Write an enzyme that holds these catalytic residues in place. Structure first.
Site, PDB file in Angstrom:
ATOM      1  N   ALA A  65       0.825  -1.204   0.000  1.00 40.89           N
ATOM      2  CA  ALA A  65       0.000   0.000   0.000  1.00 40.89           C
ATOM      3  C   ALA A  65       0.861   1.256   0.000  1.00 40.89           C
ATOM      4  O   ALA A  65       0.596   2.199  -0.756  1.00 40.89           O
ATOM      5  CB  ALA A  65      -0.947  -0.005   1.199  1.00 40.89           C
TER       6      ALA A  65
ATOM      7  N   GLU B 208       8.836  -8.059  -0.237  1.00 48.97           N
ATOM      8  CA  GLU B 208       8.584  -8.888  -1.402  1.00 48.97           C
ATOM      9  C   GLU B 208       8.747  -7.976  -2.610  1.00 48.97           C
ATOM     10  O   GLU B 208       8.358  -6.802  -2.538  1.00 48.97           O
ATOM     11  CB  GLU B 208       7.183  -9.505  -1.353  1.00 48.97           C
TER      12      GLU B 208
ATOM     13  N   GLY C 115       1.434  -6.970   6.966  1.00 48.39           N
ATOM     14  CA  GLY C 115       2.475  -7.351   7.906  1.00 48.39           C
ATOM     15  C   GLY C 115       3.705  -6.473   7.791  1.00 48.39           C
ATOM     16  O   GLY C 115       4.366  -6.183   8.792  1.00 48.39           O
TER      17      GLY C 115
ATOM     18  N   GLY D  37       3.559  -3.251   6.225  1.00 43.84           N
ATOM     19  CA  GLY D  37       3.088  -1.908   6.518  1.00 43.84           C
ATOM     20  C   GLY D  37       2.908  -1.648   8.000  1.00 43.84           C
ATOM     21  O   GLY D  37       3.149  -0.535   8.468  1.00 43.84           O
TER      22      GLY D  37
ATOM     23  N   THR E 296      -8.670  -8.826   1.526  1.00 43.59           N
ATOM     24  CA  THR E 296      -8.838 -10.272   1.585  1.00 43.59           C
ATOM     25  C   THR E 296      -8.165 -10.876   2.815  1.00 43.59           C
ATOM     26  O   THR E 296      -7.763 -12.044   2.794  1.00 43.59           O
ATOM     27  CB  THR E 296      -8.301 -10.920   0.306  1.00 43.59           C
TER      28      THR E 296
ATOM     29  N   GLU F 112      -6.199  -7.988  10.180  1.00 42.62           N
ATOM     30  CA  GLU F 112      -5.808  -6.584  10.162  1.00 42.62           C
ATOM     31  C   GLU F 112      -6.140  -5.807  11.437  1.00 42.62           C
ATOM     32  O   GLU F 112      -5.388  -4.866  11.746  1.00 42.62           O
ATOM     33  CB  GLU F 112      -6.435  -5.897   8.946  1.00 42.62           C
TER      34      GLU F 112
ATOM     35  N   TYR G 229      -7.409  -0.643  -6.879  1.00 44.72           N
ATOM     36  CA  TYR G 229      -6.362   0.066  -6.149  1.00 44.72           C
ATOM     37  C   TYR G 229      -5.857   1.267  -6.932  1.00 44.72           C
ATOM     38  O   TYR G 229      -5.514   2.294  -6.335  1.00 44.72           O
ATOM     39  CB  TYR G 229      -5.209  -0.885  -5.819  1.00 44.72           C
TER      40      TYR G 229
ATOM     41  N   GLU H 140       5.255  22.782  11.503  1.00 44.73           N
ATOM     42  CA  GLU H 140       4.040  23.588  11.518  1.00 44.73           C
ATOM     43  C   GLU H 140       2.785  22.719  11.493  1.00 44.73           C
ATOM     44  O   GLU H 140       1.733  23.147  11.982  1.00 44.73           O
ATOM     45  CB  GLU H 140       4.050  24.565  10.344  1.00 44.73           C
TER      46      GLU H 140
HETATM   47  N1  LIG Z   1      -5.550   2.342  -0.687  1.00 48.71           N
HETATM   48  C1  LIG Z   1      -4.791   1.275  -0.924  1.00 48.71           C
HETATM   49  N2  LIG Z   1      -4.777   0.233  -0.024  1.00 48.71           N
HETATM   50  C2  LIG Z   1      -4.006  -0.854  -0.256  1.00 48.71           C
HETATM   51  C3  LIG Z   1      -3.220  -0.943  -1.393  1.00 48.71           C
HETATM   52  N3  LIG Z   1      -2.569  -2.130  -1.356  1.00 48.71           N
HETATM   53  C4  LIG Z   1      -2.923  -2.786  -0.225  1.00 48.71           C
HETATM   54  N4  LIG Z   1      -3.820  -2.006   0.456  1.00 48.71           N
HETATM   55  C5  LIG Z   1      -4.459  -2.302   1.749  1.00 48.71           C
HETATM   56  O1  LIG Z   1      -3.443  -2.733   2.632  1.00 48.71           O
HETATM   57  C6  LIG Z   1      -3.883  -3.833   3.402  1.00 48.71           C
HETATM   58  C7  LIG Z   1      -2.987  -5.027   3.105  1.00 48.71           C
HETATM   59  O2  LIG Z   1      -1.663  -4.690   3.435  1.00 48.71           O
HETATM   60  P1  LIG Z   1      -0.489  -4.559   2.346  1.00 48.71           P
HETATM   61  O3  LIG Z   1       0.044  -3.149   2.271  1.00 48.71           O
HETATM   62  O4  LIG Z   1      -0.970  -5.049   1.004  1.00 48.71           O
HETATM   63  O5  LIG Z   1       0.611  -5.594   2.907  1.00 48.71           O
HETATM   64  P2  LIG Z   1       2.171  -5.256   3.090  1.00 48.71           P
HETATM   65  O6  LIG Z   1       2.392  -3.895   3.714  1.00 48.71           O
HETATM   66  O7  LIG Z   1       2.867  -5.373   1.759  1.00 48.71           O
HETATM   67  O8  LIG Z   1       2.710  -6.376   4.116  1.00 48.71           O
HETATM   68  P3  LIG Z   1       2.737  -7.957   3.782  1.00 48.71           P
HETATM   69  O9  LIG Z   1       1.806  -8.667   4.730  1.00 48.71           O
HETATM   70  O10 LIG Z   1       4.149  -8.451   3.998  1.00 48.71           O
HETATM   71  O11 LIG Z   1       2.333  -8.205   2.349  1.00 48.71           O
HETATM   72  C8  LIG Z   1      -5.313  -4.121   2.989  1.00 48.71           C
HETATM   73  O12 LIG Z   1      -6.169  -3.480   3.909  1.00 48.71           O
HETATM   74  C9  LIG Z   1      -5.444  -3.454   1.645  1.00 48.71           C
HETATM   75  O13 LIG Z   1      -6.764  -3.011   1.446  1.00 48.71           O
HETATM   76  C10 LIG Z   1      -3.225   0.107  -2.305  1.00 48.71           C
HETATM   77  O14 LIG Z   1      -2.538   0.054  -3.324  1.00 48.71           O
HETATM   78  N5  LIG Z   1      -4.013   1.208  -2.063  1.00 48.71           N
HETATM   79  C1  LIG Z   2      -9.570 -14.125  -0.318  1.00 49.68           C
HETATM   80  C2  LIG Z   2      -8.365 -14.694   0.021  1.00 49.68           C
HETATM   81  C3  LIG Z   2      -8.097 -16.014  -0.294  1.00 49.68           C
HETATM   82  C4  LIG Z   2      -9.058 -16.752  -0.953  1.00 49.68           C
HETATM   83  O1  LIG Z   2      -8.891 -18.085  -1.321  1.00 49.68           O
HETATM   84  C5  LIG Z   2      -7.997 -18.984  -0.753  1.00 49.68           C
HETATM   85  C6  LIG Z   2      -7.875 -19.094   0.633  1.00 49.68           C
HETATM   86  C7  LIG Z   2      -6.999 -19.974   1.211  1.00 49.68           C
HETATM   87  C8  LIG Z   2      -6.241 -20.762   0.359  1.00 49.68           C
HETATM   88  N1  LIG Z   2      -5.288 -21.734   0.586  1.00 49.68           N
HETATM   89  C9  LIG Z   2      -4.887 -22.160  -0.635  1.00 49.68           C
HETATM   90  N2  LIG Z   2      -3.952 -23.118  -0.813  1.00 49.68           N
HETATM   91  C10 LIG Z   2      -4.042 -24.019  -1.946  1.00 49.68           C
HETATM   92  C11 LIG Z   2      -2.829 -24.859  -2.082  1.00 49.68           C
HETATM   93  C12 LIG Z   2      -1.656 -24.676  -2.693  1.00 49.68           C
HETATM   94  C13 LIG Z   2      -0.888 -25.845  -2.482  1.00 49.68           C
HETATM   95  C14 LIG Z   2      -1.673 -26.687  -1.741  1.00 49.68           C
HETATM   96  O2  LIG Z   2      -2.873 -26.085  -1.490  1.00 49.68           O
HETATM   97  N3  LIG Z   2      -5.489 -21.560  -1.644  1.00 49.68           N
HETATM   98  C15 LIG Z   2      -6.355 -20.667  -1.030  1.00 49.68           C
HETATM   99  C16 LIG Z   2      -7.248 -19.765  -1.601  1.00 49.68           C
HETATM  100  C17 LIG Z   2     -10.268 -16.193  -1.295  1.00 49.68           C
HETATM  101  C18 LIG Z   2     -10.519 -14.870  -0.974  1.00 49.68           C
HETATM  102 MG   LIG Z   3       3.004  -7.253   0.620  1.00 50.49          MG
END
Ligand SMILES: Nc1nc2c(ncn2[C@@H]2O[C@H](COP(=O)(O)OP(=O)(O)OP(=O)(O)O)[C@@H](O)[C@H]2O)c(=O)[nH]1
Ligand SMILES: c1ccc(Oc2ccc3nc(NCc4ccco4)[nH]c3c2)cc1
Ligand SMILES: [Mg+2]
Ligand SMILES: Nc1ncnc2c1ncn2[C@@H]1O[C@H](COP(=O)(O)OP(=O)(O)CP(=O)(O)O)[C@@H](O)[C@H]1O
Ligand SMILES: Nc1nc2c(ncn2[C@@H]2O[C@H](COP(=O)(O)OP(=O)(O)O)[C@@H](O)[C@H]2O)c(=O)[nH]1
Ligand SMILES: [Ca+2]
Ligand SMILES: [Ca+2]
Ligand SMILES: [Ca+2]
Ligand SMILES: [Mg+2]
Ligand SMILES: [Mg+2]
Lengths: 438, 424, 343, 54
Positions: free
Chosen positions: A12, A71, A144, A146, A179, A183, A224, A254
């Site tokens: 984000a 990442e 994680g 952020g 997703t 959080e 996004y 300020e």
């Molecule tokens: N507004 C906005 N929100 C984002 C964006 N990308 C992720 N988010 C929000 O950020 C949260 C997820 O955290 P991320 O920033 O994607 O994760 P991260 O900081 O890369 O940390 P990791 O867990 O290591 O991937 C969710 O609530 C998302 O809705 C973005 O591009 N714009």
């Molecule tokens: C939001 C976020 C995730 C969503 O779908 C999921 C959720 C949990 C899951 N775990 C796996 N592992 C599959 C795998 C790979 C090797 C052996 O098994 N796939 C998933 C998909 C849907 C909406």
């Molecule tokens: Mg990330």
């Protein structure tokens, strides 16, 4: 001239940083290759835009920015994007395995292995600064990285730059575009350990941005990219005073002086208007009174809450475009007679106003229409504590069952840090209620 | 570059694993010789997750094929996509495991396990950043059940910080080979309780009923049952193999699905299940996805509560319509979701539909109703164990009665742990 | 299929509303902590408004207006009338009132300033002290007893020494009106009111004949239920009495002033409590209490934010709540007088 | 309604309107917490290896 360093952490933070720097280049006339024709002092200078851009002898204007993610796929978008020529590789820091939405993984496990590399790349930028103001930190609450790595970085920045100011732009979590489920944990953990290290934090709830994009831009399912373009406009209105000539909010100190009387209550509410769909061929341009009145509509706030049932500690109006002070004062007088604006007794009932004559810049081909005038209101209202109450409640529901806690303990975290963080939020929620409720 | 290492063990594990590689090779445009012949760069964007790239633009599955008999793996090598697997990754013995968990776990399997780990190590060494492992196997036999869980234990010893997911076929007296299947399954479940992060519980009883009651197959075969498993395995790995809304690795996926470490046994589902040219609407995809008839664990979700639910939709469809249908499904099942995990129903989309379907939906439920499956296995276990029936096949391989008694207690504890969160 | 939660078990009004919703077969009740509701029948104290309107894809509605306590509290109503230009201190339909904080913690000197003007000018100088923490009410003509009783937040307002007395009986009464404000801030006055009458003769020289509360008349009055059943006279009988005794109607002599007062109060706080452009919507049922003097002038006494209803009128009013306040937002598959106004 | 502190320039202006008068841990301590968490990780992994060794 005093420089500012921007730090973008996690997906984000990085993608929002990419949107902001693109908009900065469009506002300052900087081309993707870094060249700025209107800049006549080649290879140097102490203009207002130099607070965010350094200059090479070849004429390139380089953002004073660091991108950090555990990442690489998001920062690889920066490396091969339209504005790839702005940045050099020393500014883009990537790990190989992310924090998996786990605060403890970003703060302890993975963060401990990269924190020194990040501080070294930040030190390289600070060495180019003749008078560093401080840092602007972009990150999500929910990720994680952020949440976890940001709080670790904020701790070390207070050690290595104790006199510098630090401002946050934080993305508050919204289930409609997320997703993830953990959080609330990450948000409260990161707010607890960052609270004493941040001077002023601008929270942006994805729920609010999502509905503004749906309502005012007629985007059925905002992406996004849609969200970050709108966010960058708000961020730009907030940082414009640091990048252009002016007298209001001209340095990071300020912001705290004008917006944060009590240090723990440092989360100003941002409200922006007007947001107009670019698909509308012709839209009636709103007046100064109309956009100013829109600053008191909850539908335009970066966080949905009700300022009528709180108290203001400070208010700042930031206009861009065709705006003159006479029209601003006329709108304020009308609004006081029709709106419920209650200030705390120990603060003046007033408005600090800044006007920049350059109208808002929009990304060509984007969804935002060009407007003749726009305003961003920064108000420190206790009503934003509703966002803490929502978050703390979701925390309490899961933590009572210890749901997902084993993921954090497994990375070296102790369960006591959960309740320690939650007790700090309880005291924060009590501070807001003592300030804004009779 | 987030690679996954695939392992398939035993007869069931290799036959379902072979179908999985046939399905996703078709989705990625990889022909039976390992040559790409697709029409979209979306097919090759995350191809490295499951395939190694070789000389001449050849893609080799990151798959290891294990058995204690040569029979099934010869059928694989003679199958449609048999030539695509790396020849060095066929690791097999000759004695078999005789549908005996002790032979796979303690005697016959122990003699072969080290050579399998040498292949796992070689595949892991060429991974830029290993996500984790997936294993296909049954729990009712000897090799996939006994040696498979032995492999999982030795993988966790060598790769303790790597995700381990399984597709585990649960035995049923309806679709049964030997009477000792409840013994083998009870011994294996405790291994999975400790050493996996996700286990998709694929009940052969449910697969049979879906082929019979729904797909209208009066005499289903294992090939018919495995068609349902390949389609489900493809659906749950879509978010890893194709670009889209999700870019989460296995760890992030598990973090948001598993609130308690031992309760990681998922009820998978798939839609559509058609006996065929009619377009399936979004309300139909969503209603069938939550129907118990589309569930593959033979558990009634209305008999428990959902801890977490994931739903992955594939194809070009209206997301506004999907969100509306997910809302309506949650209203009809409002009393079947725990209230102490906010927003525990998540939806994701991928634009590329499977072969032969305009759109599809895959269901992943972490429900406490899965305790009905473990209760079923436990009662069949106790029915024989109280009379020590068929135990000599196991004591003859060095096992003691106490290890069965402890396996029985471990599964009663697992059942009780599910019951405590169903009441909360 | 709509969903709703119940968070006030002691609400006799919404226990019937919840009963009607289920009877339609199109409303499903959830547990009191389930956040995925369409409708919240919330609690009286500390209703978590800040958590409403944040569930994706759910239109959420609550049966209370945040901020409406300013109208439904003793000290808050007095301050609201004195400080609002729409009502002003020159308000003609609200008794001269003052907020008196007890000495162990204000308008003490201002109250005594107007008190001495009545004592000197031979005028009736009887006042009444009360507060929201009551079941404890003191009526006295000496200001010393009033200020000392409070120290043992209260309001002291002028006691209406010349009330309209019903005959036969020579007895005091008060009018309860039920008002429903919907999510569009339409103001609906229930066509049926009640007169909670005193059964004892009014003695201008004992609080039984001076306090017309339904609980006081059933506990301390010996003529309870004599003239009318339960000391509750409805509009049909009271209108028939006004025609025979005073040669006027309830609509002309009283109801015009009542409708005027309801509109003035609710329009005053509309900008502070309206949910027009909010992420959740509110409606609320109000109970207005009026007094009529011998000159047929209506005085506002108080506004109840959590009112009960009359036994005979529970079925009709609760059905009206479902009709215009609930089904207008969540349509399925007039008993009110709309008080029109300018939003 | 008083306007104070009006500053003007070519690119805009700023002012203030008043409507009504009024009525850190050291680097050592951070390293201690990071290392204490890594030690709890090493201890939990060692117990896993001990469990697997049995
Ligand atoms: N507004 C906005 N929100 C984002 C964006 N990308 C992720 N988010 C929000 O950020 C949260 C997820 O955290 P991320 O920033 O994607 O994760 P991260 O900081 O890369 O940390 P990791 O867990 O290591 O991937 C969710 O609530 C998302 O809705 C973005 O591009 N714009
Ligand atoms: C939001 C976020 C995730 C969503 O779908 C999921 C959720 C949990 C899951 N775990 C796996 N592992 C599959 C795998 C790979 C090797 C052996 O098994 N796939 C998933 C998909 C849907 C909406
Ligand atoms: Mg990330
Ligand atoms: N200024 C005044 N002059 C005359 N009578 C008054 C008065 N103020 C109050 N009363 C009497 O007091 C009685 C009830 O007072 P009040 O309304 O404060 O109690 P309460 O709020 O507990 C009743 P409710 O249940 O409707 O809220 C009324 O019947 C009315 O006759
Ligand atoms: N779904 C499915 N189940 C199978 C298949 N082959 C065997 N089984 C089941 O697996 C169990 C037998 O285990 P099996 O894999 O044949 O033994 P192994 O070779 O020792 O691992 C029984 O419960 C069978 O019903 C198959 O191809 N598909
Ligand atoms: Ca220059
Ligand atoms: Ca500091
Ligand atoms: Ca041998
Ligand atoms: Mg077999
Ligand atoms: Mg009252």
């Amino acid at each position: 001239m005093r420089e500012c360093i921007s730090i973008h952490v996690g997906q984000a933070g990085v993608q929002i940083g990419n949107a902001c720097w693109e908009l900065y280049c469009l506002e300052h006339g900087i081309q993707p290759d870094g060249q700025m024709p209107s800049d006549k002092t080649i290879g140097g200078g102490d203009d207002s835009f130099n607070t965010f851009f350094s200059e090479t002898g070849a004429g390139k204007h380089v953002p004073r920015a660091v991108f950090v993610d555990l990442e690489p796929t998001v920062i690889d978008e920066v490396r091969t994007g339209t504005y790839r020529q702005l940045f050099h590789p020393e500014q883009l820091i990537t790990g190989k395995e992310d924090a998996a939405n786990n605060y403890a993984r970003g703060h302890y496990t993975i963060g401990k292995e990269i924190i020194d590399l990040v501080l070294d790349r930040i030190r390289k930028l600070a060495d180019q600064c003749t008078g560093l103001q401080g840092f602007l930190v972009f990150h999500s609450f929910g990720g994680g990285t952020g949440s976890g790595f940001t709080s670790l970085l904020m701790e070390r920045l207070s050690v290595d730059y104790g006199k510098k100011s630090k401002l946050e732009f934080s993305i508050y979590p919204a289930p409609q575009v997320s997703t993830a489920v953990v959080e609330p944990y990450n948000s409260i953990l990161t707010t607890h350990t960052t609270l004493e290290h941040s001077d002023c934090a601008f929270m942006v709830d994805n729920e609010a941005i999502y509905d503004i994009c749906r309502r005012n831009l007629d985007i059925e399912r905002p992406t996004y990219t849609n969200l970050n373009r709108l966010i960058s406009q708000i961020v730009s209105s907030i940082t414009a005073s640091l990048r252009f000539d002016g007298a209001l909010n001209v340095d990071l100190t300020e912001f705290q002086t004008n917006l944060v009387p009590y240090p723990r209550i440092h989360f100003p509410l941002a409200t922006y208007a007007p947001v107009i769909s670019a698909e509308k061929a012709y839209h009636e341009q709103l007046s100064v009174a109309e956009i100013t009145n829109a600053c008191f509509e909850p539908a335009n706030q970066m966080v949905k809450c009700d300022p009528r049932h709180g108290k203001y500690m400070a208010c700042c109006l930031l206009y861009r475009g065709d705006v003159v002070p006479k029209d601003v004062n006329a709108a304020i007088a009308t609004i006081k007679t029709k709106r419920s604006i209650q200030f705390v007794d120990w603060c003046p009932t007033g408005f600090k106003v800044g006007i920049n004559y350059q109208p808002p810049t929009v990304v060509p081909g984007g969804d935002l229409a060009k407007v003749q005038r726009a305003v961003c209101m920064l108000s420190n209202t206790t009503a934003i504590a509703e966002a803490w109450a929502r978050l703390d409640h979701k925390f309490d529901l899961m933590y009572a069952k210890r749901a997902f806690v084993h993921w954090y303990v497994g990375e070296g975290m102790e369960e006591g840090e959960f309740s320690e963080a939650r007790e700090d939020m309880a005291a924060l929620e009590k501070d807001y209620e003592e300030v804004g409720v009779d | 570059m987030r690679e996954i290492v695939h392992i398939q063990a035993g007869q069931c594990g290799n036959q379902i694993g072979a179908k999985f590689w046939e399905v996703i090779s078709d989705e990625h445009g990889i022909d039976p010789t390992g040559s790409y012949h697709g029409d979209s760069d979306l097919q090759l964007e995350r191809i490295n997750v499951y395939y190694n790239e070789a000389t001449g633009n050849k893609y080799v599955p990151r798959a290891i094929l294990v058995d204690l008999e040569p029979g099934t793996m010869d059928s694989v090598r003679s199958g449609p996509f048999g030539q695509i697997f790396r020849p060095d990754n066929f690791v097999f013995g000759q004695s078999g495991a005789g549908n005996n968990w002790a032979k796979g776990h303690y005697t016959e399997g122990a003699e072969l396990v080290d050579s399998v780990l040498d292949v796992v190590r070689k595949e892991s060494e060429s991974c830029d950043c290993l996500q984790g492992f997936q294993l296909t196997h049954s729990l009712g036999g000897g090799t996939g059940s006994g040696m498979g869980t032995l492999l999982i234990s030795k993988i966790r010893e060598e790769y303790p910080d790597r995700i381990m997911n399984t597709f585990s076929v649960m035995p049923s007296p309806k679709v049964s080979d030997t009477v000792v299947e409840p013994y083998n399954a009870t011994l294996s479940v405790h291994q999975l309780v400790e050493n996996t992060d996700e286990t998709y519980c694929i009940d052969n009883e449910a697969l049979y009923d879906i082929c019979f009651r729904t797909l209208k197959l009066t005499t289903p075969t294992y090939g018919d049952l495995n068609h349902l498993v390949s389609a489900t395995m493809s659906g749950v790995t879509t978010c890893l193999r194709f670009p889209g809304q999700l870019n989460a690795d296995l760890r992030k996926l598990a973090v948001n699905m598993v609130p308690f470490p031992r309760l990681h046994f998922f009820m998978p589902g798939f839609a559509p299940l058609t006996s065929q040219y009619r377009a399936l609407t979004v309300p139909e995809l969503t209603q069938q996805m939550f129907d118990s008839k589309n569930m593959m664990a033979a558990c009634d979700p209305r008999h428990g509560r959902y801890l977490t639910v994931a739903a992955i939709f594939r194809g070009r469809m209206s997301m506004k319509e999907v969100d509306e249908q997910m809302l309506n499904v949650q209203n009809k099942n409002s009393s079947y979701f725990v209230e102490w995990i906010p927003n525990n129903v998540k939806t994701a989309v991928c634009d590329i539909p499977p072969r032969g379907l305009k759109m599809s939906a895959t269901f992943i439920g972490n429900s406490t109703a899965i305790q009905e499956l473990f209760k079923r296995i436990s009662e069949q276990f106790t029915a024989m164990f109280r009379r020590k029936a068929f135990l000599h096949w196991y004591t003859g391989e060095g096992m003691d009665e106490m290890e069965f008694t402890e396996a029985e207690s471990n599964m009663n504890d697992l059942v009780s742990e599910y019951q405590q969160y169903q009441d909360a | 299929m709509y969903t709703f939660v119940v968070r006030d078990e002691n609400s006799s009004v919404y226990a019937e509303v919840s009963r009607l919703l289920l009877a339609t077969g199109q409303w499903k009740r959830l547990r009191k902590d389930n956040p995925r509701f369409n409708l919240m029948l919330g609690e009286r104290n500390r209703l978590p408004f800040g958590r409403l309107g944040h569930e994706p894809g759910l239109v959420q509605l609550v049966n209370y207006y945040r901020g409406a306590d300013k109208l439904c509290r003793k000290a808050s109503l007095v301050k609201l009338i004195k400080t609002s230009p729409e009502l002003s201190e020159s308000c003609t339909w609200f008794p001269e009132s003052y907020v008196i904080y007890p000495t162990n913690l204000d308008e003490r000197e201002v109250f005594l300033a107007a008190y001495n003007r009545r004592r000197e000018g031979r005028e009736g100088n009887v006042w009444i002290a009360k507060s929201s923490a009551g079941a404890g009410i003191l009526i006295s003509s000496e200001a010393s007893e009033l200020l000392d009783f409070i120290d043992e937040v209260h309001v002291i307002q002028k006691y209406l020494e010349k009330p309209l007395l019903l005959e036969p009986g020579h007895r005091k009464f008060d009018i309860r009106s039920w008002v429903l404000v919907d999510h569009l801030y339409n103001i609906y006055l229930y066509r049926e009111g009640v007169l909670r009458t005193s059964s004892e003769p009014y003695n201008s020289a004992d609080k039984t004949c001076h306090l017309t509360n339904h609980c006081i008349q059933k506990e301390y009055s010996k003529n309870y239920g004599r003239y009318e059943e339960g000391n509750e006279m409805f509009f049909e009988e009271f209108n028939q009495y006004l025609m025979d005794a005073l040669n006027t109607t309830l609509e002309n002599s009283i109801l015009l002033q009542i409708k005027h007062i309801i509109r003035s109060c609710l329009m005053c706080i509309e900008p502070a409590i309206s949910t027009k452009h909010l992420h959740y919507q509110s409606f609320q049922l109000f109970g207005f209490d009026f007094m009529v003097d011998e000159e047929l002038k209506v005085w506002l006494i108080e506004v109840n934010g959590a009112p009960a209803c009359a036994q005979k009128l529970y079925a009709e009013l609760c059905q009206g709540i479902v009709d215009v306040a609930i089904s207008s937002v969540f349509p399925l598959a007039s008993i009110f007088i709309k008080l029109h106004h300018h939003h | 309604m008083e306007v104070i502190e009006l500053n003007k320039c070519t690119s805009g202006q700023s002012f203030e309107v008043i409507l009504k008068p009024p009525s850190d841990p050291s680097l050592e301590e951070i390293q201690k917490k990071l290392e204490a968490a890594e030690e709890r990780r090493k201890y939990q992994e060692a117990e896993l290896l001990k469990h697997l060794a049995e």
